[PDB]
From a paper:
The spherical cowpea chlorotic mottle virus (CCMV, diameter d = 28 nm) is one of the most studied viruses. Its 180 capsid protein (CP) copies are arranged into 20 hexamers and 12 pentamers, resulting in a quasi-icosahedral T = 3 symmetry. The complexation process is driven by protein–protein interactions and by electrostatic interactions between the negatively charged phosphate backbone of the DNA origami and the positively charged amino acid (aa) residues (+9) in the 26-residue arginine-rich N-terminal region of the protein (190 aa, ~20 kDa). Due to the CPs’ innate protein assembly pathways, reassembly results in the formation of hexagonal sheets, empty spheres and tubes.
After characterizing the starting materials (dimensions are given as average (avg) ± s.d. throughout), 6HB (davg = 6.1 ± 0.6 nm) and intact CCMV (davg = 26.8 ± 1.0 nm) with negative-stain transmission electron microscopy (TEM), the complexation of isolated CPs and 6HB was performed at physiological conditions (pH 7.3, 150 mM NaCl) using the CPs in excess. Negative-stain TEM images and small-angle X-ray scattering (SAXS) for samples complexed at ε = 2k (6HB-2k) reveal 6HB complexes with increased diameter due to a highly ordered protein shell (bottom), which develops from nucleation sites along the origami structure (ε < 2k). Two-dimensional (2D) classification of particles picked along the filaments and 3D refinement of ab initio 3D models, obtained from the recorded images only, results in helical structures with 4.3 Å resolution (left) for the first protein layer and 8 Å resolution for the second protein layer. The protein tubes are assembled of hexamers (top right), similar to tubes formed by in vitro assembled human immunodeficiency virus (HIV). Whereas the first layer is characterized by a 1-start helix with a turn of 63.8° and a rise of 15.4 Å, the second layer has a 3-start helical symmetry with a turn of 38.8° and a 29.6 Å rise. The density in the lumen of the protein tubes corresponds to the encapsulated DNA origami. N-termini facing the origami create a positive electrostatic potential surface for the inner surface of the protein tube (bottom right). For the outer tube surface, in contrast, the negative electrostatic potential is predominant (top right), hence allowing the formation of protein multilayer complexes. We were not able to detect a specific physical contact point between the protein layers, or between DNA and protein, suggesting that unspecific electrostatic and protein–protein interactions were the driving force for the assembly. The cryo-EM densities of CPs encapsulating 6HB clearly show large holes between the hexameric units, resembling the swollen state, which is expected according to the solution conditions used.
Residue numbers in the entry:
A (entry chain F), B (entry chain B), C (entry chain A), D (entry chain D), E (entry chain E), F (entry chain C), ...: 1 to 147
């Protein structure tokens, strides 16, 4: 498997798709994990992003998803996507990686967002949208307070 | 300033005292900070503990506090304390240190607890009970999943 | 990412195709931006051209596009094209690292044109066509309006 | 004719005023051209500014214009102006240049505004207002993406 | 534009004037700007004074102003003034400069005053009188107190 | 005595606390000195802050003061303060200095405030809180306007 | 892109196939381009041959072509061909190159021929067979005649 750079680090989380009618593009918002939620960590720099997708077997249609800046109408977002994850492939992935170097981890919570499309309708949680983020290593204080 | 050992790391948090009548002991319960709350980190090992105290200047009487195993009547807890933090001293804190080597960080949330006493009444937040914990360095996954 | 040569530069502009019935081929016409439309900058020489295509996900069929000298019957244009961009590929692009070397930027406005084909119908905004063009860095007036 | 400093550059743009009744002052608003309205170039620093005026000969009386920070009542603006252009002169110009050194080109788009006054009525297009601006040489995109 | 001497410095401020009937001479009282109002700065010495004038364009008469020692009845002061600024001239200005070398900035607040005349009536804010003063540079404490 | 950095400068001012009953904490608001009140200077940046104290000799209690971000109930601020000035010490001063590097002088007027405590009652002017601030040098224009 | 050897040179031309019913194999005759038709040039020697293909996009079948010695019944030639160009592949080209080293350009006009096959019917100009040839450089006389 792929390795992060020296001085970089990995974390992973999850979100579930909202129910939606066919051909509609839905939107999903990135919320940070608790391990990074403090004001010390939000100012770290992103190094790579790796969207991923997995699905329960009764979903029959095409399914596509991507990471972009937030686009003012949801469906249009794919038109600037530097790659698209796609259940028509053998492997349903979209490793960028170069898209977001030097962006603050705050900004990856602020306005980068995840979009999802299916040619058939979805019920809640029919799709699970993993995400993986590789970023500058978090640090904890090396010493107690003074007395 | 005091350094943590190699492979160990600092962290800090807070709790505030409830209102209490004079010469009554009160309990305070440790709850872990968000940075440590995950199932990966709760199983780490404690290395040192450092109770500390700070107080707003109108508080007149004695104030004493300690960290112990939970004692079935609150006032009795001091009678097993390996040291006591005490506003009679010049420096109020009470470094133990090695009362708790090899205890699980979960257990430091489970049943080690903080007790506080004053010979005069307190109103809410009149005392701020800092804490520091020095513990094995948290680790994050070095690599992405397989595709 | 791919760099231009020393002293060369890049610019980008956009077009959205009109509606078309299935299997029709449609033309798209270049127009120069204002900074390049000066009589000082129009005389620059093209170094590379890069066609790039993106589409909203509901376009189900094949989509193909290419750059050619303007053909009197539009559908034939692909037959002369030195390369074709095609949504059957993994990356929907076509690079021409040779075809237009040394052509004047005016001529790239005059008689090179972009062609687009789809095996299913299209409606306005269903496809976005980029172009990227590389040339020696343009220049700006060094002085105000004189005497 | 006057030249920009070493490493500085020039740009020019135009506006044509709306109709106005006699002695009423009116406002003219800057908008940046696209090549400057990049997030790379918007943050460049202004070096000199020149207001220049021209008119068709049937405009009978005095015409005056000036550049100021925006004013709450438009007619007052001349009173703050570091210089005024005035068709009573032989040459209808007003080079500042000191007024705006070090202001951001975005700010020159934001809140510097141009005012115009005539001692007789005006109809659309009876007056043309130039502006010239000097700033450090703008730059263009030049590079490849990664994989 | 003209620079101040080494160790001298420029400051600038505004005064309006009240309504007046035609041919009436009026007085404007100098008050120091806030940047200089403290008892440290008042004892600095003046090097040059520049009177300057502007007006909103509907003012039709002549307008004249000057700086003088304060006079028992305002109109007479023009006969004493070393120079007059005058809207009939090419430049509506009067650099003195010799009048006030070595006068204390407090004295420039005390008994030098500004006089203003117009051949037609005026209303509040029709004429705005700038003043510009060149004077020994202000200074501040280079050192903290003793502890 | 300690000196400000190159390009930085010292200024000093005053505030007098109101009357208060014993053990009451009180607040003091940082109004700027007139020498810095103009819009040109408010956007300078702070380098160090130096709280100081003095009192007329009949004040019998302890007295303590500190500089903090403004707090919901005044007494709490001593628990947040990075250092405390104190009449009981050998010298009462409490040079921070790290607390406010790079903060805007406007912000030092906005939401940093002074807190004061005494273990005995006070009357108007019994305690006088000096303050001293080290900050980027104030500057004045080098030249007159155009004529 | 691939280059010809020193002393060798590139030239390129065209032929358009006639209409044919499905599964019919057809032949195409290699007429020389005018630039090489003179008796001086026909005795040059071939270095490489590069068959190429393109088609207008509505052609629905498979299409295959190859270069061989002329064969008694056209379909058989695919069984003799050293390589086959093919629309079903990732890229349709079929660079030989070994097939014809040292053959005379006259012979490449005489008895080498192009064969073309489609699994569906064709109409005139649906398929366009480019060809590219790399061969000993054409030369022109260095001097006038004697007078």
């Amino acid at each position: 498997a792929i390795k992060a750079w020296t001085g970089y680090s990995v974390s992973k989380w999850t979100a579930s798709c909202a129910a939606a009618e066919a051909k509609v593009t839905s939107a999903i918002t990135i919320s940070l994990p608790n391990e990074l939620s403090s004001e010390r960590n939000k100012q770290l720099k992103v190094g790579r992003v790796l969207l991923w997708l997995g699905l329960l077997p009764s979903v029959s249609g095409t399914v596509k998803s991507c990471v972009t800046e937030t686009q003012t109408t949801a469906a249009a977002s794919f038109q600037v996507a530097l790659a698209v994850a796609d259940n028509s492939k053998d492997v349903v992935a979209a490793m960028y990686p170069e898209a977001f170097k030097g962006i603050t981890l705050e900004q990856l919570a602020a306005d980068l967002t995840i979009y999802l499309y299916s040619s058939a309708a979805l019920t809640e949680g029919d799709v699970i949208v993993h995400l993986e983020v590789e970023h500058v290593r978090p640090t904890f204080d090396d010493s107690f307070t003074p007395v």
